[PDB]
Design a protein around this nucleic acid. Structure first.
Ligand SMILES: [Mg+2]
Ligand SMILES: [Mg+2]
Ligand SMILES: [Mg+2]
Ligand SMILES: [Mg+2]
Ligand SMILES: [Mg+2]
Ligand SMILES: [Mg+2]
Ligand SMILES: [Mg+2]
Ligand SMILES: [Mg+2]
Ligand SMILES: [Mg+2]
Ligand SMILES: [Mg+2]
Ligand SMILES: [Mg+2]
Ligand SMILES: [Mg+2]
Ligand SMILES: [Mg+2]
Ligand SMILES: [Mg+2]
Ligand SMILES: [Mg+2]
Ligand SMILES: [Mg+2]
Ligand SMILES: [Mg+2]
Ligand SMILES: [Mg+2]
Ligand SMILES: [Mg+2]
Ligand SMILES: [Mg+2]
Ligand SMILES: [Mg+2]
Ligand SMILES: [Mg+2]
Ligand SMILES: [Mg+2]
Ligand SMILES: [Mg+2]
Ligand SMILES: [Mg+2]
Ligand SMILES: [Mg+2]
Ligand SMILES: [Mg+2]
Ligand SMILES: [Mg+2]
Ligand SMILES: [Mg+2]
Ligand SMILES: [Mg+2]
Ligand SMILES: [Mg+2]
Ligand SMILES: [Mg+2]
Ligand SMILES: [Mg+2]
Ligand SMILES: [Mg+2]
Ligand SMILES: [Mg+2]
Ligand SMILES: [Mg+2]
Ligand SMILES: [Mg+2]
Ligand SMILES: [Mg+2]
Ligand SMILES: [Mg+2]
Ligand SMILES: [Mg+2]
Ligand SMILES: [Mg+2]
Ligand SMILES: [Mg+2]
Ligand SMILES: [Mg+2]
Ligand SMILES: [Mg+2]
Ligand SMILES: [Mg+2]
Ligand SMILES: [Mg+2]
Ligand SMILES: [Mg+2]
Ligand SMILES: [Mg+2]
Ligand SMILES: [Mg+2]
Ligand SMILES: [Mg+2]
Ligand SMILES: [Mg+2]
Ligand SMILES: [Mg+2]
Ligand SMILES: [Mg+2]
Ligand SMILES: [Mg+2]
Ligand SMILES: [Mg+2]
Ligand SMILES: [Mg+2]
Ligand SMILES: [Mg+2]
Ligand SMILES: [Mg+2]
Ligand SMILES: [Mg+2]
Ligand SMILES: [Mg+2]
Ligand SMILES: [Mg+2]
Ligand SMILES: [Mg+2]
Ligand SMILES: [Mg+2]
Ligand SMILES: [Mg+2]
Ligand SMILES: [Mg+2]
Ligand SMILES: [Mg+2]
Ligand SMILES: [Mg+2]
Ligand SMILES: [Mg+2]
Ligand SMILES: [Mg+2]
Ligand SMILES: [Mg+2]
Ligand SMILES: [Mg+2]
Ligand SMILES: [Mg+2]
Ligand SMILES: [Mg+2]
Ligand SMILES: [Mg+2]
Ligand SMILES: [Mg+2]
Ligand SMILES: [Mg+2]
Ligand SMILES: [Mg+2]
Ligand SMILES: [Mg+2]
Ligand SMILES: [Mg+2]
Ligand SMILES: [Mg+2]
Ligand SMILES: [Mg+2]
Ligand SMILES: [Mg+2]
Ligand SMILES: [Mg+2]
Ligand SMILES: [Mg+2]
Ligand SMILES: [Mg+2]
Ligand SMILES: [Mg+2]
Ligand SMILES: [Mg+2]
Ligand SMILES: [Mg+2]
Ligand SMILES: [Mg+2]
Ligand SMILES: [Mg+2]
Ligand SMILES: [Mg+2]
Ligand SMILES: [Mg+2]
Ligand SMILES: [Mg+2]
Ligand SMILES: [Mg+2]
Ligand SMILES: [Mg+2]
Ligand SMILES: [Mg+2]
Ligand SMILES: [Mg+2]
Ligand SMILES: [Mg+2]
Ligand SMILES: [Mg+2]
Ligand SMILES: [Mg+2]
Ligand SMILES: [Mg+2]
Ligand SMILES: [Mg+2]
Ligand SMILES: [Mg+2]
Ligand SMILES: [Mg+2]
Ligand SMILES: [Mg+2]
Ligand SMILES: [Mg+2]
Ligand SMILES: [Mg+2]
Ligand SMILES: [Mg+2]
Ligand SMILES: [Mg+2]
Ligand SMILES: [Mg+2]
Ligand SMILES: [Mg+2]
Ligand SMILES: [Mg+2]
Ligand SMILES: [Mg+2]
Ligand SMILES: [Mg+2]
Ligand SMILES: [Mg+2]
Ligand SMILES: [Mg+2]
Ligand SMILES: [Mg+2]
Ligand SMILES: [Mg+2]
Ligand SMILES: [Mg+2]
Ligand SMILES: [Mg+2]
Ligand SMILES: [Mg+2]
Ligand SMILES: [Mg+2]
Ligand SMILES: [Mg+2]
Ligand SMILES: [Mg+2]
Ligand SMILES: [Mg+2]
Ligand SMILES: [Mg+2]
Ligand SMILES: [Mg+2]
Ligand SMILES: [Mg+2]
Ligand SMILES: [Mg+2]
Ligand SMILES: [Mg+2]
Ligand SMILES: [Mg+2]
Ligand SMILES: [Mg+2]
Ligand SMILES: [Mg+2]
Ligand SMILES: [Mg+2]
Ligand SMILES: [Mg+2]
Ligand SMILES: [Mg+2]
Ligand SMILES: [Mg+2]
Ligand SMILES: [Mg+2]
Ligand SMILES: [Mg+2]
Ligand SMILES: [Mg+2]
Ligand SMILES: [Mg+2]
Ligand SMILES: [Mg+2]
Ligand SMILES: [Mg+2]
Ligand SMILES: [Mg+2]
Ligand SMILES: [Mg+2]
Ligand SMILES: [Mg+2]
Ligand SMILES: [Mg+2]
Ligand SMILES: [Mg+2]
Ligand SMILES: [Mg+2]
Ligand SMILES: [Mg+2]
Ligand SMILES: [Mg+2]
Ligand SMILES: [Mg+2]
Ligand SMILES: [Mg+2]
Ligand SMILES: [Mg+2]
Ligand SMILES: [Mg+2]
Ligand SMILES: [Mg+2]
Ligand SMILES: [Mg+2]
Ligand SMILES: [Mg+2]
Ligand SMILES: [Mg+2]
Ligand SMILES: [Mg+2]
Ligand SMILES: [Mg+2]
Ligand SMILES: [Mg+2]
Ligand SMILES: [Mg+2]
Ligand SMILES: [Mg+2]
Ligand SMILES: [Zn+2]
Lengths: 99, 124, 83, 138, 208
RNA sequence: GGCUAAUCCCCCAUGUGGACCCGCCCCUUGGGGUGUGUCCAAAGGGCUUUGCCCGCUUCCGGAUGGGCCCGCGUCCCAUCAGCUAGUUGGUGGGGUAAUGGCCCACCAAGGCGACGACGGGUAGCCGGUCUGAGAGGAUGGCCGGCCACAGGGGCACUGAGACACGGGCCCCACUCCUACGGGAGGCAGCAGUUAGGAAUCUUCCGCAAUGGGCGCAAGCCUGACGGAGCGACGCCGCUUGGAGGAAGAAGCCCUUCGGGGUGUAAACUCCUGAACCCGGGACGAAACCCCCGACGAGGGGACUGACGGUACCGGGGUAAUAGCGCCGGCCAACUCCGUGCCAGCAGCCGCGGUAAUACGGAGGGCGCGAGCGUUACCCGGAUUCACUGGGCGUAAAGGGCGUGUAGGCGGCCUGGGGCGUCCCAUGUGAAAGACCACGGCUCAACCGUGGGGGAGCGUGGGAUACGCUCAGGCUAGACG
RNA sequence: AUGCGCGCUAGGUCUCUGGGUCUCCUGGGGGCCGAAGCUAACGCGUUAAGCGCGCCGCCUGGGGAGUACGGCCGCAAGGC
């Protein structure tokens, strides 16, 4: 099975590519609770069809570029910018924490 | 700590520092005597304890104890360092193994002979 | 190519072999594709040869080559018998 | 807001019984009802009733204890000697069937929530399912 | 070399008769005849209350000296019994009772255990028709343990067996005196043997 | 510079078929079919010579071994907080078996980071192993799997496969030969040497076995390997005797001078017979090959040992090594004498300043025993990093106080979804190991055969209490 | 020398500030004794140091040492 996941599109900014943020959950190997972690997949949108805020299924594919091994499968939810604004908030928090 | 706190910070495994750099992780180091002298012990006792400054194969200079009654060591004799320290002495971290190299064993000792490095005498 | 052969599982002076399908280039005693039979030359028990002719004939069908001794034992179990 | 409602129930019971109160009210939820029903069935409470306090639903748990005793401190052996939460929010604990605890050498129980409903460790094992391990009582 | 040297001294330190000499441990010489105190300069001195450790160690030593086993063989045996299914103490005794030399003693072929050992190592014993010269060897139920056909007219053997005429053997054992053969019927339980040993003390000793 | 053969190189043909552009069809990333057009095949040799063999060529499958890509897991320091220019994507192209900024050109302005980027330190990874009641901690020698390297650094060539340990080129360091122009090496293969170190083996035997390369075979090669040697390094087996033998010798020790002790221990009697000598003497080895049959199936025949005259069996046969730690408490084992804060002990507590079970000897005793101790190191105890399983008024420990960002956490009822959760089936979880059982070396160690178990992940199916999500209600919280 | 929030577990008494048919009752603060319970003790006890949940901060023998080095603040002193 080509692995297929779900995320939300946090980056408009490339040509025929979309940054898709994908959360995942799992129990903690020692302390036992559920922890939530996430990573950004760089996905192939040849049509420039998927836009920001789109929650999309994403798929294991033939390599496109460096960093692009995944292409966009379909659109599931449209326009959750609550997710995007959450992630953007984090990225703005980055500007603290330094020197 | 909350569990979430443990998931964040975790618990710190704590390391122990080696009571002995004979380096190498080695059980013994060979060395040469530098100074072979006597020293007075810490506050609760009195005696003259016999020690050598040793320059190790391992690059270190260390003071080693010379156990037992008699001893033959002098400025140039080469010796074996076995480690384990002397409590009522200042900075003596290792013992000299007797019987090895220029260390002789302890003459006439009948009792715990392998400590002190003396052979089993014959009988009549 | 792929071989049907013996691999040494005994102990010193106590040799016991596994009859084994493996690539030719493996270590003798290293990881193989299948264990088809067992062989105990010193015949120390009633069964000193097991074969499983069914898998043997499979591997022959896809062109594993048995070594000379392998094939002796194989044929001893009548993997090759036509009647 | 109670952060853990279910614990708040268990504890309401704990303090209640530790003073030998005859009954105690807990704000009602269907799930709490279930847990209770298990205790009742298991002989740990006397039973409970759905009830109304200032027009808000509660479940009233009627507690049981042992006989009176002799010597100094006549106070009765508790029937619920021990009752505690296992899963809590913020650490959720789920056992599969082979991981289902036996309790106090069989003399106690554990109450698990499962997709077959709320059952005792024995119940769950016989049903051959696991789930969220809610609490242990003994 | 499992212990070789003055023995009735161990009888003495363990405080009970172990029968290590066979006959004469049956005489009024056993030194448990009027020296039941332990060996040494201090034997006749009032004895201080034993530590828990002492008690346990001593019980273990009692059992070991009874069988005449190395510590290591004894430990290995114990551990091998702690592994096995069934009560460890009893399994242990059963395993100890299964050494060939012990079986030879038990069958009357030899007078003491140490003697039985010598008989085995010297190949005067067969088990199911073949010579077994290992004392450690495990007799299994069903085994026939015989005097060697060649060793059959040996002086020590003849005397030892004409002794056993009319004697009763262990209830886990069969004996045929004419044939100088015997069969190990089943493993013994702790009631089958009389050992002056609380085995549970030994389980505890190795439990530390 | 000259000659010459081929299963060496080439050219024309045959085109089963295949490759490439283009069109259509099916399928869906470059999978399959089809049509026109262009392009592409070969190699001989042996005979029991009219046929059979060993080969060659094209194509389709198979098998086996690989490449590349993805999810997840994978040490320490935040006193490393920002990193990024082929860097991030796009188009076209180069390159390859193949995707890919792998490389290039042109375009865009991206990509990554407190969910720890960047930097520094350390390190082959694993099956497993050690320890622990477990959870956990520690580890990865030997064996098996993977990776990486072959004096250091780069590079390609040949080839199915290498960027190749006993192949090639160059730079560097080193050794050696030199007629000073210039050459030759590369044990982290087996042995062995030397240096370093507390420390790690024979310049052995053999190709008989199993395995590998080439050969139609016969065979050849094989320090892979099968064996032997040395080391108590480990593990297991076994010996140094067995029975009798005094109210209990000498010696020695203690002594209240009566005696107590070493002790059945010795002496001695009888018996057995490690060592050792003689005779027999293996298994591992039946194939390949030859013969009939058909070079098949099947049947028959022959050769072949390093271990080694070894193991083993039979006969004969001698009473035949014991040592090391310890005896103040933890800890099992006490007395005398010597010493007099000395000499010395010592893991901690602490012993020694004239009555020392703590130093040193002796008698005695306790413990293990071909070992016994010591040193180093790991886990243990240590619930002393506390998931299991700790805490913070005064013992170490509440931030000086707030605001709120990320993040953690979320009252009552209903319905959908079924992600967490749980269940069934299935696939995987190699072998070895661990476990149980039977079995093979006289036992064991060691070994074989069988069986069981199992986390995790993949797929299909199912459950819906709880957690989530979506929808819709409520008012006990919150706000107004 | 006692983080915040919530729920639960006898009472007695004194007080500050509301409401109520105003011996008294019912809220919200401040004190003292004290049930259960906790605690090494002293003590805490509806103003928990009791029973529970959520989340944050912190601890891991003493001395060396709030030191050294590094970084970051600060005009400095000095702070983290
Ligand atoms: Mg776009
Ligand atoms: Mg691309
Ligand atoms: Mg698609
Ligand atoms: Mg930035
Ligand atoms: Mg900061
Ligand atoms: Mg002193
Ligand atoms: Mg000299
Ligand atoms: Mg030490
Ligand atoms: Mg000493
Ligand atoms: Mg290979
Ligand atoms: Mg047999
Ligand atoms: Mg057969
Ligand atoms: Mg066939
Ligand atoms: Mg599971
Ligand atoms: Mg057992
Ligand atoms: Mg008897
Ligand atoms: Mg019986
Ligand atoms: Mg008896
Ligand atoms: Mg008894
Ligand atoms: Mg144990
Ligand atoms: Mg233990
Ligand atoms: Mg020419
Ligand atoms: Mg010519
Ligand atoms: Mg042509
Ligand atoms: Mg054609
Ligand atoms: Mg293409
Ligand atoms: Mg050609
Ligand atoms: Mg031609
Ligand atoms: Mg493949
Ligand atoms: Mg660059
Ligand atoms: Mg362009
Ligand atoms: Mg491209
Ligand atoms: Mg290139
Ligand atoms: Mg290539
Ligand atoms: Mg170009
Ligand atoms: Mg460019
Ligand atoms: Mg992340
Ligand atoms: Mg490095
Ligand atoms: Mg390294
Ligand atoms: Mg490491
Ligand atoms: Mg721990
Ligand atoms: Mg583990
Ligand atoms: Mg590791
Ligand atoms: Mg090595
Ligand atoms: Mg090796
Ligand atoms: Mg390896
Ligand atoms: Mg290199
Ligand atoms: Mg080298
Ligand atoms: Mg170099
Ligand atoms: Mg190189
Ligand atoms: Mg080739
Ligand atoms: Mg390479
Ligand atoms: Mg080489
Ligand atoms: Mg090579
Ligand atoms: Mg050159
Ligand atoms: Mg030369
Ligand atoms: Mg050379
Ligand atoms: Mg060269
Ligand atoms: Mg070498
Ligand atoms: Mg040297
Ligand atoms: Mg070797
Ligand atoms: Mg040779
Ligand atoms: Mg060969
Ligand atoms: Mg061969
Ligand atoms: Mg060939
Ligand atoms: Mg021929
Ligand atoms: Mg030839
Ligand atoms: Mg050669
Ligand atoms: Mg070898
Ligand atoms: Mg040596
Ligand atoms: Mg030696
Ligand atoms: Mg041994
Ligand atoms: Mg006699
Ligand atoms: Mg008599
Ligand atoms: Mg006497
Ligand atoms: Mg005497
Ligand atoms: Mg005298
Ligand atoms: Mg007197
Ligand atoms: Mg006397
Ligand atoms: Mg004797
Ligand atoms: Mg006599
Ligand atoms: Mg004889
Ligand atoms: Mg004789
Ligand atoms: Mg001979
Ligand atoms: Mg043979
Ligand atoms: Mg034969
Ligand atoms: Mg041959
Ligand atoms: Mg013939
Ligand atoms: Mg013919
Ligand atoms: Mg023929
Ligand atoms: Mg044939
Ligand atoms: Mg034949
Ligand atoms: Mg020979
Ligand atoms: Mg021969
Ligand atoms: Mg014969
Ligand atoms: Mg013989
Ligand atoms: Mg003798
Ligand atoms: Mg004798
Ligand atoms: Mg001794
Ligand atoms: Mg004391
Ligand atoms: Mg001990
Ligand atoms: Mg003691
Ligand atoms: Mg003196
Ligand atoms: Mg004096
Ligand atoms: Mg004195
Ligand atoms: Mg004094
Ligand atoms: Mg003394
Ligand atoms: Mg001492
Ligand atoms: Mg002493
Ligand atoms: Mg002594
Ligand atoms: Mg002794
Ligand atoms: Mg050792
Ligand atoms: Mg180690
Ligand atoms: Mg430790
Ligand atoms: Mg523990
Ligand atoms: Mg610690
Ligand atoms: Mg603690
Ligand atoms: Mg905890
Ligand atoms: Mg603590
Ligand atoms: Mg607190
Ligand atoms: Mg105070
Ligand atoms: Mg404090
Ligand atoms: Mg404060
Ligand atoms: Mg706040
Ligand atoms: Mg929030
Ligand atoms: Mg919500
Ligand atoms: Mg809820
Ligand atoms: Mg939430
Ligand atoms: Mg629902
Ligand atoms: Mg599901
Ligand atoms: Mg089902
Ligand atoms: Mg399965
Ligand atoms: Mg697999
Ligand atoms: Mg599974
Ligand atoms: Mg396995
Ligand atoms: Mg095994
Ligand atoms: Mg198991
Ligand atoms: Mg067996
Ligand atoms: Mg398991
Ligand atoms: Mg597993
Ligand atoms: Mg599913
Ligand atoms: Mg449903
Ligand atoms: Mg709602
Ligand atoms: Mg309303
Ligand atoms: Mg009340
Ligand atoms: Mg008023
Ligand atoms: Mg008040
Ligand atoms: Mg109070
Ligand atoms: Mg009280
Ligand atoms: Mg508490
Ligand atoms: Mg109290
Ligand atoms: Mg209140
Ligand atoms: Mg009040
Ligand atoms: Mg307050
Ligand atoms: Mg509170
Ligand atoms: Mg407290
Ligand atoms: Mg600590
Ligand atoms: Mg410190
Ligand atoms: Mg300061
Ligand atoms: Mg620094
Ligand atoms: Mg500074
Ligand atoms: Mg600052
Ligand atoms: Mg400044
Ligand atoms: Mg200041
Ligand atoms: Zn006796």
């Amino acid at each position: 099975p080509k692995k297929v996941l779900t995320g939300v599109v946090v980056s408009d900014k490339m040509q025929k590519t979309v940054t898709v943020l994908v959360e995942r959950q799992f129990p903690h190997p020692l302390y036992g609770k559920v922890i939530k972690r996430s990573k950004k997949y760089l996905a192939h949108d040849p049509e420039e069809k998927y836009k920001l805020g789109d929650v999309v299924e994403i798929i294991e594919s033939r390599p496109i570029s460096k960093r692009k091994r995944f292409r966009v499968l379909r659109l599931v939810e449209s326009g959750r910018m609550d997710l995007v604004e959450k992630y953007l908030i984090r990225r703005q928090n980055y500007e603290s924490l330094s020197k | 700590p909350t569990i979430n706190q443990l998931v964040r910070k975790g618990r710190e495994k704590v390391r122990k520092k080696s009571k002995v750099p004979a380096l190498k992780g080695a059980p013994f180091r060979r060395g040469v005597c530098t100074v072979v002298r006597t020293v007075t012990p810490k506050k609760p006792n009195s005696a003259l304890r016999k020690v050598a400054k040793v320059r190790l194969t391992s690059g270190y200079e260390v003071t080693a104890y010379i156990p037992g009654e008699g001893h033959n060591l002098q400025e140039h004799s080469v010796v074996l360092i076995r480690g384990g320290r002397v409590k009522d002495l200042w900075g003596v971290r290792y013992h000299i193994v007797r019987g090895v190299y220029d260390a002789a064993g302890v003459k006439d000792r009948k009792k715990s002979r392998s400590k002190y490095g003396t052979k089993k005498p014959k009988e009549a | 190519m792929v071989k049907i052969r013996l691999a040494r599982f005994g102990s010193k002076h106590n040799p016991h072999y596994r009859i084994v399908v493996t690539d030719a280039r493996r270590k003798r005693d290293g990881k193989y594709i299948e264990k088809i039979g067992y062989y105990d030359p010193r015949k120390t028990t009633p069964d000193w040869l097991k074969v499983d002719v069914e898998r043997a004939r499979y591997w022959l069908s896809v062109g594993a080559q048995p070594t000379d001794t392998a094939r002796r034992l194989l044929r001893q179990a009548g993997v090759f018998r036509q009647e | 807001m109670l952060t853990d409602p279910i614990a708040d129930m268990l504890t309401r019971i704990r303090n209640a019984t530790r003073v030998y109160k005859e009954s105690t009210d807990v704000p009602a939820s269907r799930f709490k009802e279930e847990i209770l029903r298990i205790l009742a069935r298991e002989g740990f409470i006397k039973g409970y009733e759905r009830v109304d306090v200032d027009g808000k639903p509660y479940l009233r748990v009627y507690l049981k204890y042992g006989p009176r005793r002799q010597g100094p401190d006549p106070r009765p052996e508790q029937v619920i000697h021990h009752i505690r939460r296992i899963s809590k929010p913020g650490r959720r604990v789920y056992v599969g069937v082979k991981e289902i605890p036996r309790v106090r050498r069989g003399l106690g129980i554990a109450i698990l929530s499962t997709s077959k409903g709320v059952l005792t460790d024995r119940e769950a094992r016989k049903l051959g399912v696991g789930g969220e391990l809610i609490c242990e009582v003994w | 070399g499992r212990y070789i040297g003055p023995v009735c001294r161990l009888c003495r330190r363990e405080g009970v008769k172990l029968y290590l000499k066979g006959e004469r441990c049956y005489s009024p010489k056993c030194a448990m005849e009027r020296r039941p105190y332990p060996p040494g300069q201090h034997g006749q001195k009032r004895a201080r209350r034993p530590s828990d450790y002492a008690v346990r160690l001593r019980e273990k030593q009692k059992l070991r000296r009874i069988y005449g086993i190395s510590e290591r063989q004894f430990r290995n045996l114990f551990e091998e019994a702690s592994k096995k299914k069934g009560v460890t103490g009893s399994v242990f005794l059963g395993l100890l009772e299964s050494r060939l030399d012990n079986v030879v003693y038990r069958l009357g072929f030899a007078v003491s255990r140490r003697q039985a050992r010598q008989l085995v190592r010297h190949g005067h014993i067969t088990v199911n028709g073949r010579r077994v010269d290992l004392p450690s060897y495990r007799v299994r139920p069903g085994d026939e343990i015989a005097v060697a056909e060649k060793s059959r007219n040996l002086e020590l053997i003849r005397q030892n067996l004409e002794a056993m005429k009319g004697r009763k053997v262990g209830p886990w054992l069969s004996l045929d005196v004419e044939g100088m053969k015997g069969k190990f019927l089943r493993l013994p339980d702790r009631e089958d043997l009389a050992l002056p040993v609380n085995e549970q003390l030994v389980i505890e000793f190795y439990s530390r």
